Design a protein. Sequence first.
Length: 353
Amino acid sequence: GASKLRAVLEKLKLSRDDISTAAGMVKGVVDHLLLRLKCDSAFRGVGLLNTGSYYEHVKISAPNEFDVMFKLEVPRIQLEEYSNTRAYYFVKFKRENPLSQFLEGEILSASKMLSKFRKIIKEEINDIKDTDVIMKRPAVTLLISEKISVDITLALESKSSWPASTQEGLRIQNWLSAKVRKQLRLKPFYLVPKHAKEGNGFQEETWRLSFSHIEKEILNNHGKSKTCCENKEEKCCRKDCLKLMKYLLEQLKERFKDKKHLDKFSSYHVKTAFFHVCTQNPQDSQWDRKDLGLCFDNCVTYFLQCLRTEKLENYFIPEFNLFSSNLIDKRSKEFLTKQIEYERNNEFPVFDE
Ligand SMILES: Cc1ccc(-c2cc(C(=O)O)c3c(c2)ncn3CCc2ccccc2)c(Cl)c1
Ligand SMILES: [Zn+2]
């Protein structure tokens, strides 16, 4: 039961120094790219966005896979929703500025910005032989010494009120309080470019709303009680359940690598499902450390439901379905449904030693 799960968590602790070292490699490469981008007139305002809950500038999204976000302070943004998608928007500037070279009419071109961003980085990773860095295809994906991959996301920062599509999102009122929800909604939001001809290209220059910076505000301040996990009397298992969900997905993706059925699923999906379960189970007494196995089952059952019903709401944008057929094909969701069901009904053989 829970003892198999606690053993998994104890084993995860053994790779803490591998992780810390890789995160240091990433940090060096990114600092170097940061000062070069700052030379460019378009990217003079670039900086690192703190999104990690463990390491500040670097978020780990899988073993030796790391995520980094470069933000661009961008004033006076005017948004126009693209074809009722709730998450994708055209970016204009309320009535010159450094980004003027990327305009196509009033509209800021995602693909032109991405193109110069990529070009500057690809040119720059050529030029330090202290580490070996190439570029794969997240604006850019790097590979460091053929082992550690870094996804680098460029994002516009907007200090305006959040778009109306988020009005019913971040549904934390009954768990973390309406006061906290108000404070978090005073923070900036971010727009990440979607190339006009990439993916199944819209043929438009649209940007997706991004709230990845909110994760650390909540994951490390996660209780109904303000002192949850700050003393020995208030120990919950929220963080451990999330770790186990991520590890479940990681291990399944590894086992199904022969035909890569699970390529489209990521830790973002797991995290989104996990925080929906936090909304559903707002009391700290529902996450008692002694109940690790039941709490994990709660999390897996909800993820399974999302898979079977092909529905996983964006935590911030309820009308945006992360599991829509536009984003993940039906056979992928049907396939993972079957595997998650098997693991849950058989006490997670994927965690066996
Ligand atoms: C309580 C809470 C707080 C934050 C998050 C959160 C948000 C985002 C986001 O909206 O950017 C995340 C993320 C985690 N992990 C990865 N991304 C990035 C997604 C993304 C964005 C744009 C294009 C493609 C993909 C969650 Cl689920 C819950
Ligand atoms: Zn806690």
